Amino acid sequence: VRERMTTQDVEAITPQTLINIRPVVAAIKEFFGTSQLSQFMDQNNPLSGL
Amino acid sequence: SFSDPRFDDVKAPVDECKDKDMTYAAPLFVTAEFINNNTGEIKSQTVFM
Amino acid sequence: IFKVGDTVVYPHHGAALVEAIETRTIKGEQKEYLVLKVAQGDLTVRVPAENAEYVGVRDVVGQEGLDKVFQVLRAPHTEEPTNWSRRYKANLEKLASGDVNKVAEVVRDLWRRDQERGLSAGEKRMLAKARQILVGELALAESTDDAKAETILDEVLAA
Numbered sequence A: 001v002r003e004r005m006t007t008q009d010v011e012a013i014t015p016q017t018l019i020n021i022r023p024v025v026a027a028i029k030e031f032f033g034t035s036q037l038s039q040f041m042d043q044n045n046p047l048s049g050l
Numbered sequence B: 001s002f003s004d005p006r007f008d009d010v011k012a013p014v015d016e017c018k019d020k021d022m023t024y025a026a027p028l029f030v031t032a033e034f035i036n037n038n039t040g041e042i043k044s045q046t047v048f049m
Numbered sequence C: 001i002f003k004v005g006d007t008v009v010y011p012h013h014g015a016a017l018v019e020a021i022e023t024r025t026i027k028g029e030q031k032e033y034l035v036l037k038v039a040q041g042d043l044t045v046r047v048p049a050e051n052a053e054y055v056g057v058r059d060v061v062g063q064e065g066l067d068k069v070f071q072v073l074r075a076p077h078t079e080e081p082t083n084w085s086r087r088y089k090a091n092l093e094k095l096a097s098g099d100v101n102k103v104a105e106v107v108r109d110l111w112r113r114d115q116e117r118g119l120s121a122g123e124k125r126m127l128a129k130a131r132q133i134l135v136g137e138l139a140l141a142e143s144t145d146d147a148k149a150e151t152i153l154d155e156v157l158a159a
């Protein structure tokens, strides 16, 4: 946003144009898969999930 | 600016997601706001996050 | 000048509607912040009524402007050198300028062009975007629909 605040022209831009959500959604998808703390639920008896 | 996050319903229930291998997600919605200092504006949308 | 319900045309974001006048304040002065929402991106704009002419808001265009843009159309005489990058830069500067007659000149130039030889993808997207905002302006000036204004174009696009 701070980059394209300057390169864009004024009196034409909007928050729909300024905002790129793809690094945020890539950070979420890169956390939930392929991290240490996000593991498969160990279920072979209900004590193990707990 | 950035303000007021609000959620929708989940797009698909639990068993259907576990069946069709979709994740159990819900959309974000955030009211962004752009203010021009020189001439005076706000630009308020509902940005899908 | 402004009243509630005037479909007043914002310069870049097409034609917009007003709802009320906010008397909100900065530094104690409750300026007449007209709340002006658009229908394209569903965004609402609040603008102080003082510098509305400075930002370049404009009321809707009438029959004399309709005859002027029909005069700008149907007159196929133009010259631009064949280095198409200069033509692209010229019509992009036009599109950032925001004048209805020049927008009509560029959509008639690109209609004359793609009717003749063929266009690139960015050229076609440029013609489509400028034509769609011109359709929106002509429809909200003549108080009618998109298909009606597009048929009006297709019968005045050098027909």
Ligand SMILES: C/C(=C\[C@H](C)CCCCC(=O)O)[C@@H]1O[C@@H]2C=C[C@@H]1OC(=O)\C=C/C=C\C=C\[C@H]1O[C@@H]3C[C@H]1O[C@@H](/C=C/C[C@H]1O[C@H](C[C@H](O)[C@H]1C)[C@@H](O)[C@@H](O)/C=C/CC/C=C/C2)[C@@H]3C
Pocket: A035, A036, A037, A038, A039, A040, A041, A042
């Ligand atoms: C070494 C380690 C996790 C090991 C893979 C499992 C625990 C080792 C301890 C032990 O031997 O009991 C560390 O885990 C985390 C971060 C760094 C380390 O990961 C690491 O560096 C190593 C792997 C990190 C993420 C792996 C993700 C995916 O790899 C597959 C699918 C995803 O997860 C793995 C499965 C993990 C569940 C395990 O659960 C264990 C039993 C089995 O070993 C597994 C079923 C149970 O002991 C369970 O109750 C306990 C889990 C530990 C809780 C997390 C601690 C920190 C499966 C192999």
